[PDB]
UniProtKB/Swiss-Prot annotation, chains A, B:
It comes from Severe acute respiratory syndrome coronavirus 2 (2019-nCoV). Subunit of the fusion protein that is processed upon entry into the host cell. Mediates fusion of the virion and cellular membranes by functioning as a class I viral fusion protein. Contains a viral fusion peptide that is unmasked after S2 cleavage. This cleavage can occur at the cell membrane by host TMPRSS2 or during endocytosis by host CSTL. In either case, this triggers an extensive and irreversible conformational change that leads to fusion of the viral envelope with the cellular cytoplasmic membrane, releasing viral genomic RNA into the host cell cytoplasm. The chain holds residues 1117 to 1147 of 1273 of the full protein. Glycans are attached at residue 18. This is Spike protein S2'. It comes from the Viruses.
Amino acid sequence: TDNTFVSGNCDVVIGIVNNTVYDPLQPELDS
Amino acid sequence: TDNTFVSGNCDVVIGIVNNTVYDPLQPELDS
């Protein structure tokens, strides 16, 4: 998330690919 | 907070207006 930002929708971009965006806040929930 | 940076105070800048700054870490506290 730190290297990317959210814009538009997946049905807009032509040629978009699916993947998992790492969220540094998820592993911090264990602390 | 990602699109702005906190500096100075509210009594210096001329023409400052009041508003609310959304914090993405506030709603994540429930998890």
